[PDB]
Amino acid sequence: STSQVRQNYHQDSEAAINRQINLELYASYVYLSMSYYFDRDDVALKNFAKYFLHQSHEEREHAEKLMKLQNQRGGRIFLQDIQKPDEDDWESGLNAMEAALHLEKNVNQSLLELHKLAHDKNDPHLADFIETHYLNEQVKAIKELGDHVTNLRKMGAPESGLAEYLFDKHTLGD
Amino acid sequence: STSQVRQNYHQDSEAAINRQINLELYASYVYLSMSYYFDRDDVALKNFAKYFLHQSHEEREHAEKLMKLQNQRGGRIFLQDIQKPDEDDWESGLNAMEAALHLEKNVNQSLLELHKLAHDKNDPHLADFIETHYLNEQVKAIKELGDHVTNLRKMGAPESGLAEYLFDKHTLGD
Amino acid sequence: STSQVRQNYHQDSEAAINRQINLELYASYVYLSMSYYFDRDDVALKNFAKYFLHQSHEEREHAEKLMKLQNQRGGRIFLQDIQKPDEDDWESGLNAMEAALHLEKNVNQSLLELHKLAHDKNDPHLADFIETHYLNEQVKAIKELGDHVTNLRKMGAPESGLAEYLFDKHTLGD
Amino acid sequence: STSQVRQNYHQDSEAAINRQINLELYASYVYLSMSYYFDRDDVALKNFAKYFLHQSHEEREHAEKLMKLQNQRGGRIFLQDIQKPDEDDWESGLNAMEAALHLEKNVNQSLLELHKLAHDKNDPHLADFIETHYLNEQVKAIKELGDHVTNLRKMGAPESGLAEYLFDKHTLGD
Amino acid sequence: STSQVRQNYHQDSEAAINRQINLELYASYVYLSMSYYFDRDDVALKNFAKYFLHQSHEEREHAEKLMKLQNQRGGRIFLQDIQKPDEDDWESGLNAMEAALHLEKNVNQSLLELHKLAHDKNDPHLADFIETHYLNEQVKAIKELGDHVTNLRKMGAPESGLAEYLFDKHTLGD
Amino acid sequence: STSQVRQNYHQDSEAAINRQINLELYASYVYLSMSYYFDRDDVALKNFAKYFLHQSHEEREHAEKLMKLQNQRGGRIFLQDIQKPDEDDWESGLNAMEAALHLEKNVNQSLLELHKLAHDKNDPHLADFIETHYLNEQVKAIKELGDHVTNLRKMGAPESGLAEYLFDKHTLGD
Ligand SMILES: O=C(NO)c1ccc(C(=O)NO)o1
Ligand code: NA
Ligand code: NA
Ligand SMILES: [Zn+2]
Ligand SMILES: [Zn+2]
Ligand SMILES: [Zn+2]
Ligand SMILES: [Zn+2]
Ligand SMILES: [Zn+2]
Ligand SMILES: [Zn+2]
Ligand SMILES: [Zn+2]
Ligand SMILES: [Zn+2]
Ligand SMILES: [Zn+2]
Ligand SMILES: [Zn+2]
Ligand SMILES: [Zn+2]
Ligand SMILES: [Zn+2]
Ligand SMILES: [Zn+2]
Ligand SMILES: [Zn+2]
Ligand SMILES: [Zn+2]
Ligand SMILES: [Zn+2]
Ligand SMILES: [Zn+2]
């Protein structure tokens, strides 16, 4: 069918959207994994644990937002498997942060491509949606992972464990 | 003359804005008419009446801030007569819901054509204007009207006058 | 047909009422034009603009009120084209006020004939309706415009731009 | 490495918990899809949608509390892919209710086998865990889903389009 | 070294951003000069004075938000000397308002050029940055300075001492 | 011309004030530069940044009060180019503190010489103005910079990344 509400809504755009949803749920899955990793009795950095748990809940917010744009435009949601992440053990506070930064650069890439598509297919509505709710969020996050990584490294992580423990106290703990 | 504030504002943009002004005022007249049709002693659905008197007042807001925009950029407002609606009797609640859907998807086509003009003339201010204050509002508008229609249909409207009475109570009365 | 509520309601009154509705929308439209005219970067008298905009929203109430009385008496609303105002460029504050006084004297005329018709068709309900909700409002609005004209002319307008700028500050801006 | 906190926690229990974690995440995914299904403009039952969006967030909670449990006991979390749901179109609100029921009765069955496992490994902490935080919860949840289905049926669902609309109003909307 | 956070950030964009910073710091300097001009014992227009000083601090905000952006995107800040303003003596309130109009149109074109660049390099994050934090802020400033220049002109300035005094009180003084 | 307020205000003092104005504008630029350096994703010390950004704005205040003073005494302001800081990269937090220190003694130096000028020209208003608003402010700034440098060196700056991270937390974040 074609929904009564659909208008200037191209099907690459619609299919690009069902792709992002999955990517956002993917990242939500990664951050859950990082979170409970730093909750391990042998790692025990509670603020690393809550930092990523919060990112896990936000990625969820991202996907649900897109699931809403879809129906709003008259596209139809098709869901897919969520890949388990690439690790079971994230090694270190620094390394987990670097993986986070890598993950978000990559989600950012897809958002930019999704913007290009929306622009190329002359969807001003879809494109302002990406710029308003996603683009600058991803710059902020990526700037923030960058800063953390810079600070964990300058402090002598992940060699110095003292380093990671003070960072969990003094940066991720308000 | 050429206004002292004019900058990057193409006379084709100026004349498109004036067109949109008239179309918004037109919208408002349609809803005004729909509203006072449901206030007739033989239609007597008050929440339908309120729901359109509101959109009537909303569309008037839409025109008024196009008028501001026009002067903001140093163009010049020319008003044209306001066409009376297509109908005097709007038949039923479902139907008026189907009519407004049609109307808003139409006004939305105009906004997407105003915006593409803006893009092509390299007017980012005007394109952003359209994006923030109109596109998204139209997609929320289109999406809602669709929802009401689907519900009226599934309830058994327009035949069932029970359904329309109940939809007025449980859906448009808060 | 004939509405189950109609009573001592003559169809000339009904057609007289549809006419006034249009006329009120007309004035509503004239006052909008005046308003955004003084919002022009090359006119720029904010309080002239806010004054006429407020008159715009009141005429809209003036007309919705009449559309209410129509359905109330079981008459039936037929709308009509809203003719664009007789100017796009209202020249000055003095001249805008003078046009406005002309406009309302003319609308006052139409109401008085409507009262005459209501009286002549022995409709004391329609007659009290015009006495209560319109007649003294039209005397107040005519007197107010006259005083503004008197003051703007006594301040040496419209050749003294100083004149009109002080009037906008000291009379229309509280 | 064997965790410094592990005590009377059998590696069969550990692997049984990780299994439940995945099942709970999976249910969360099912409710998610059920939810934004009723957000489509052709379904348009907003309280069905709210009701399922909530259970999705609850099933998430279910998983998170299991991941805390694993680490509390000295086990090690291993996530796995999240299987997308069986349907992309859940047909009707009655049906989704019937599917949800089936789903919940399925997860209840897994926790009773986890419970029997715990008991047989003489793991009373893990049995008391399942007793307090899951068993009565699923039992309340199964009973409510039975109630809603029984009611949707008794009102004439899913054929009576009015029925589902009203259940969404009168039962799922407070 | 490429900054760790960089992504879709063009070296033209970065250098153009560095130019806009200088241009904003140059704006703030001009408005500073204008403000203490009116503070002179032989000009003595405190509201002109306070008007431009507020505008001076605004421009400094415009620059600092550009700088933060450079860092967010991984760009690199390079400052250059701040050109002293063109005049030491700004003649009068009218001429000062005119010169601000010229200044802000010049800033506005540089920013439209910066947006164009951003679009030419497929940097939607940058373009929507310029869109939402600068473009309509420049239109507002340009409209307001338009109105001010107009109202000063119609009053009789710069020939009428009275006019620049009363505009100081009744417009620049709230 | 000679100003109508001018009294016991020497041309050299008028000259030395104008130059002092420029030097405070310079100090504000330096501090602004140091601030956004510490905002870089590869330096990432938020409280060094806040510290220097607060300096930056205070120095602006220093200059505006000189501009105010100049007009009070009947002198005439002449603004010069504001030269860009010596550095684009400030290396480290300790080296930035040390360069702040060097700058503030240089500013102290010129302020003391401006005081000697005022004494020499028997200008006690000018002398007390300098004493009252700048002299102890300069001593306080230099004492605080001295202490910071001292602490940063004892902690092992600049070699110690940890030292600069802990100083940012425990001294500059309150
Ligand atoms: O044979 C049994 N069930 O069929 C059995 C043996 C021991 C238990 C028990 O309850 N342990 O706590 O149950
Ligand atoms: Na935009
Ligand atoms: Na009477
Ligand atoms: Zn995301
Ligand atoms: Zn993210
Ligand atoms: Zn500490
Ligand atoms: Zn509209
Ligand atoms: Zn609309
Ligand atoms: Zn384009
Ligand atoms: Zn009911
Ligand atoms: Zn009227
Ligand atoms: Zn009137
Ligand atoms: Zn006055
Ligand atoms: Zn569960
Ligand atoms: Zn459940
Ligand atoms: Zn600016
Ligand atoms: Zn500006
Ligand atoms: Zn200073
Ligand atoms: Zn200083
Ligand atoms: Zn002495």
- Residue given tokens 């042998």 in the structure block: A42
Q: E82: helix, coil or strand?
A: strand
CA–CA distance, F116 with A141 (Å, rounded to integer): 54
| Cβ-defined contacts of E116-120 (< 8 Å, 24+) | E116/B122, E116/B124, E117/E10, E117/E12, E117/E13, E117/E16, E118/E13, E119/B124
CA–CA distance, E58 with E63 (Å, rounded to integer): 9
Which one-letter DSSP state was computed for residue F159? T
CA end-to-end span of chain C, whole Å? 52
Sign of CA pseudo-dihedral D14, D15, D16, D20: positive
Residue D112, number of CB atoms within 10 A of its CB: 14
Residue pair C107/C27 in contact (Cβ under 8 Å)? The answer is yes
Residue C73, CB-side half-sphere exposure with 13 Å CA sphere: 26
Burial C46-70 (b: 16+ CB within 10 A, else e): bbbbebbbebbebbbebbbebbebb
Q: Which tokens sit at B8?
A: 């990057």
HEC profile for chain F? CCCCCCCCCCHHHHHHHHHHHHHHHHHHHHHHHHHHHHCCCCCCCHHHHHHHHHHHHHHHHHHHHHHHHHHHCCCCCCCCCECCCCCCCCCCHHHHHHHHHHHHHHHHHHHHHHHHHHHHCCCHHHHHHHHHHHHHHHHHHHHHHHHHHHHHHHCCCCCCHHHHHHHHHHHHCC
Q: Which tokens sit at C125?
A: 């309900």
CA–CA distance, B110 with C161 (Å, rounded to integer): 40
CA–CA distance, F8 with F124 (Å, rounded to integer): 9
E 101-120 residues with CB < 8 A to B = 101, 105, 108-109, 112, 115-116, 119
CA of E103 to the centre of ligand 16 (A): 10
Sign of CA pseudo-dihedral F128, F132, F133, F136: positive
Domains and CATH numbers, chain E: 2-173 (1.20.1260.10)
Residue pair F111/F123 in contact (Cβ under 8 Å)? The answer is no
Sign of CA pseudo-dihedral D84, D89, D93, D99: negative
Instruction: Tally A–F CB contacts below 8 A.
Output: 34
Nearest by CB: A5 against B130, B136, B146: B146
Q: Which tokens sit at A151?
A: 């600070």
E147 touches chain C (CB under 8 A): yes
Q: What is the dihedral of CA A94, A95, A101, A106, to 10 degrees?
A: 180
Taking contacts as CB-CB distances below 8 angstroms, the residues of chain B near D161 are 153-156
| Ranges of H-type helices in C39-92 | 46-72
CA–CA distance, C92 with C34 (Å, rounded to integer): 10
CA–CA distance, E136 with D174 (Å, rounded to integer): 44
Q: Quick one: which H or E segment has residue E95?
A: helix E93-120
Per DSSP, what are the bridge partners of residue C79? none
Q: Quick one: which H or E segment has residue E101?
A: helix E93-120
- Evaluate the omega torsion of the peptide bond into residue E85 and state whether it is cis, within 30 degrees of 0: no
Residue pair E148/E138 in contact (Cβ under 8 Å)? The answer is no
- Evaluate the omega torsion of the peptide bond into residue E158 and state whether it is cis, within 30 degrees of 0: yes
CA–CA distance, F63 with C5 (Å, rounded to integer): 79
Which bound ligand lies closest to the C-alpha atom of B134? 7
Q: C45: helix, coil or strand?
A: coil
Residue pair E5/E72 in contact (Cβ under 8 Å)? The answer is yes
Which one-letter DSSP state was computed for residue C82? B
CA–CA distance, A20 with A107 (Å, rounded to integer): 8
Burial E3-14 (b: 16+ CB within 10 A, else e): bbbbbbbbeebb
Residue pair D162/B155 in contact (Cβ under 8 Å)? The answer is yes
Q: Which tokens sit at C119?
A: 């009286």
Taking contacts as CB-CB distances below 8 angstroms, the residues of chain C near E170 are 165-166, 169
- Residue given tokens 């940058």 in the structure block: E126
D165 touches chain A (CB under 8 A): no
CA–CA distance, A17 with A77 (Å, rounded to integer): 9
Q: E126: helix, coil or strand?
A: helix
Closest C-alpha to A68, from D49, C121, D162, F149: D49
Burial E76-88 (b: 16+ CB within 10 A, else e): bbbbeebebbeee
Sign of CA pseudo-dihedral E135, E138, E142, E144: positive
- Residue given tokens 């109908």 in the structure block: B87
CA Rg, chain E, in Å?
Answer: 18
CA Rg, chain C, in Å?
Answer: 18
Under an 8 A CB cutoff, do B88 and C67 touch? no
- Nearest residue on chain D to A66, judged by CA atoms? D36
Q: Which tokens sit at C52?
A: 């006429």
CA–CA distance, B143 with D44 (Å, rounded to integer): 10
Residue C125, number of CB atoms within 10 A of its CB: 13
CA–CA distance, C107 with C94 (Å, rounded to integer): 20
Per DSSP, what are the bridge partners of residue E82? F82
Closest C-alpha to A24, from D32, D86, E73: D32
This structure's resolution (Å) is 2.3
**Between the CA of residue F76 and those of A86, C34, E50, F68, what are the distances in Å?**
69, 47, 18, 10
CA of A122 to the centre of ligand 9 (A): 8
Closest C-alpha to E115, from B125, B82, D19, B63: B125
Angle at E94 between CA E88 and CA E97, to 5 degrees: 75
Amino acid identity for residue D150 in this structure: T
HEC profile for D52-91? HHHHHHHHHHHHHHHHHHHHHHCCCCCCCCECCCCCCCCC
How many angstroms separate the CA of residue E146 from the nearest CA in chain B?
Answer: 6
CA–CA distance, D14 with D92 (Å, rounded to integer): 38
Under an 8 A CB cutoff, do A29 and D82 touch? yes
Residue pair D164/D45 in contact (Cβ under 8 Å)? The answer is yes
Closest C-alpha to B33, from C25, C77, C66: C77
CA of D88 to the centre of ligand 9 (A): 35
At B82, give phi and psi (nearest 5°).
Answer: -105, 110
Under an 8 A CB cutoff, do E81 and F76 touch? no
Residue pair F104/F142 in contact (Cβ under 8 Å)? The answer is yes
Q: Quick one: which H or E segment has residue A105?
A: helix A93-120
List the binding residues of F for Fe cation. Answer: 24, 59, 62, 104, 138
Q: B19: helix, coil or strand?
A: helix
Subunits with 3+ Cβ pairs within 8 Å of E are A, B, C, F
B3 touches chain E (CB under 8 A): yes
Under an 8 A CB cutoff, do F68 and E40 touch? no
CA of B102 to the centre of ligand 16 (A): 43
Taking contacts as CB-CB distances below 8 angstroms, the residues of chain A near F43 are 150
CA–CA distance, F135 with D169 (Å, rounded to integer): 74
Residue A82, CB-side half-sphere exposure with 13 Å CA sphere: 25
CA of D168 to the centre of ligand 14 (A): 23
Closest C-alpha to F148, from F166, F167, F129: F167
CA of C169 to the centre of ligand 13 (A): 8
Under an 8 A CB cutoff, do A166 and F162 touch? yes
A 34-93 residues with CB < 8 A to B = 71-73
Contacts of A100 (CB under 8 A, 6+ apart): A30, A31, A34, A52, A55, A145
Which bound ligand lies closest to the C-alpha atom of F119? 20
CA–CA distance, A168 with D36 (Å, rounded to integer): 38
CA–CA distance, C64 with C21 (Å, rounded to integer): 8
In chain C, % helix, strand, coil (3-state, to 5) comes to 70, 0, 30
Taking contacts as CB-CB distances below 8 angstroms, the residues of chain C near B67 are 32, 36, 39
Burial D32-58 (b: 16+ CB within 10 A, else e): bbbbbbbbbbbbbbbbbbebbbebbbe
CA–CA distance, C143 with B130 (Å, rounded to integer): 42
Q: Is C100 exposed, middle or buried (0-12, 13-18, 19+ CB in 10 A)?
A: buried
Closest C-alpha to E136, from B132, B134, C41: B132
Residue pair A39/D68 in contact (Cβ under 8 Å)? The answer is yes
- Evaluate the omega torsion of the peptide bond into residue C158 and state whether it is cis, within 30 degrees of 0: yes
How many angstroms separate the CA of residue E102 from the nearest CA in chain B?
Answer: 10
Residue pair C93/C35 in contact (Cβ under 8 Å)? The answer is no
CA end-to-end span of chain D, whole Å? 51
Closest C-alpha to B52, from B109, B20, B99: B99
| Ranges of H-type helices in chain B | 11-38, 46-73, 93-120, 124-130, 136-155, 161-170
